[PDB]
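Cross-posted from the bioinformatics board.
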Amino acid sequence: FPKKMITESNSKDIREYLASTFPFEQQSTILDSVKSIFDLQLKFRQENLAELKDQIILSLGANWQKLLDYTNKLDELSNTKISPEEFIEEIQKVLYKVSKLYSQFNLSIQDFALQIIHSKYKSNQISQNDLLKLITEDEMLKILAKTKVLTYKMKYFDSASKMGINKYISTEMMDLDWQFSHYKTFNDALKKNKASDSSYLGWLTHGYSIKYGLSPNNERSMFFQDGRKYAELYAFSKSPHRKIIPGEHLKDLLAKINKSKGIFLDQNALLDKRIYAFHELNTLETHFPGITSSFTDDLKSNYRKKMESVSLTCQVLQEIGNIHRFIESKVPYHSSTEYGLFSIPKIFSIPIDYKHGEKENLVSYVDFLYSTAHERILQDNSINQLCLDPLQESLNRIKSNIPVFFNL
Amino acid sequence: FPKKMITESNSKDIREYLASTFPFEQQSTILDSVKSIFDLQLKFRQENLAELKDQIILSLGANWQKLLDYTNKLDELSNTKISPEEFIEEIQKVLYKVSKLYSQFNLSIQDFALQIIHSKYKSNQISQNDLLKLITEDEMLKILAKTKVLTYKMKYFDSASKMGINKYISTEMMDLDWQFSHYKTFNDALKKNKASDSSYLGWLTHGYSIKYGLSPNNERSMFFQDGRKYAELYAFSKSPHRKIIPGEHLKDLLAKINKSKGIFLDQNALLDKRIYAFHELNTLETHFPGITSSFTDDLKSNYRKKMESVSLTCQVLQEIGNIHRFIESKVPYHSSTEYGLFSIPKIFSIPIDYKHGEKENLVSYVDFLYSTAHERILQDNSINQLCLDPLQESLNRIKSNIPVFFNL
């Protein structure tokens, strides 16, 4: 299928549609850097807790009793206007004390508690100081990292695998999804308060992404899952001395960085290895600016532009996956959710029929998304394997399915 | 009771006795810095495993089955001459996969595996390179720290509490005891290989000492149990720049160090607080030399000599506790061990009667031990609370009991 080139002009109709249609209104879009362009979450979240409780009650008719107490306690704590001190103390107890079916229910309870913390902050029921007292605890950071990784894996891994974008899942881009908005406010508060906390959280999160099979590799990592390696990275970031003949105690880190850059740039290396090296290098540069930079042997070997290209490709594939799941939800006689367990309650389910002008806006969104990407990626022979090829394959897949779903 | 002053001369008789009598032969003594002076562990360790197995078999007559498989597997693996590669792979599986009674048995199995690793290294059945491949793994270091702390707590905490020396238990001196010799070889190998590993292990060990109630305090620590704090300490040790107007990013550490020094030196502070501050400062200075030093405000405020005095006091109290437990074992109709669960098997039990000249050597050992201490401690008014007082009280206790135990 030929790729699309329709520039970027007259996008008023699409911009309005995305700002007024669920779930697009609860998220941003890449179509925002081009220089050519609440009060409902409460009732939505309340109904999800009611459905979870109803399923637990039924299973006890066949330690489930313990799960029901926690579920009832969270519902009780959320719909009551009490003192901030009491809310903090009560919620801390629940989170710290927490078969295939049992694990799934257990994780949802943990995630709902964080959603409840999130709703109270936005409604000014708790101040900024009380929030920081909670989330700056090392145990809270480890809970945030593990719950984010595990919840993301539970919901979209099978969907992503059936379409073929699982290899491009990026830890640095899991907070852009509409269901993970609460994590972004917490990260933003931590960055403003103390930049070192956001970097430590990022390092932990990627370590857990590695541990739980999101980034598979035969060889063990060389930067994550080890307190000494974080200590070395921290020591390196705090250095006014820009390595004028540095010491032998930190000269092994540059060799490891160079080996990964060599592997990434090596066009003969296996696809699986290059993407792993990309994910490793992307996190390091985002949270430790300048660690992967080394003048003189970077200007000839175009590196910066290649990283930008792969990062744009990853973002685009995620937005396409969300659009695909959306279109696949408007099918007659559905009675099931495509966004994971306890995602959309029956009361707030997506309407079965198409609203007037929706089809045209969706096709325009798709076309503008593919046309914006092409004007930025690097077209050459050394990289056309991690960027152009997957984008073309995805375009081929989306254009084949759309004419089928729009005809009942 | 008047304190003892008999100098140090003609100690040939005592030195020989300690080198030929169990368990003194399996340990060192402080009487070694004064300028005036195997093949059995195998059968001892083998018999202890047989007694543990025999008790598990009996309890199954009332998941105990799982514990018996591990116990049988360790006995099978130890008495067989196989390839180093197979031993490494088999032992790793056991250690990583591991009521009040159940926990005690579970910890002993873990400790025995480390004792088996220790025996193979000394008999040259495994090389130095294979040993380092195992013990340099982060998980192995965490296992070493937790098992050391928990095993030490299981065996001597009640004994130490009944005599009154529990507050002076020092993490930096738990490897001098005859039963913890295997830990010292591992620490020495790590220091020679990479000094940063011994410091990281020490930091973890003290963090676990704090976590498991060995060093109680109302307020949370400010240096341990937090990866960011280790990162700050590491960054500080790697600094050729000796803080000529340092940066604001590490100026909060000196305030925290100064607050602890202020508390330690404050004669009006509670006993519990001063000893906690002492233990915190002692670990920092041992593993991060120079961190607690600050010229000009240290020479007038005698600090170095006070730390030396408390450290000597702690060592002396530990040696006295071992002597007390030894004398208390030679009592008619005993049929029980004073050195903890599965410490001394019936076959190798301590003889009931006294060997000729033993009583005189024990009294000489005690007298020389108390006389050597007095010639080194600081005698003043600002510290005579953490050193002289406990030593006098201990002397009073030991002299009252000895004339009773030596008369049947």
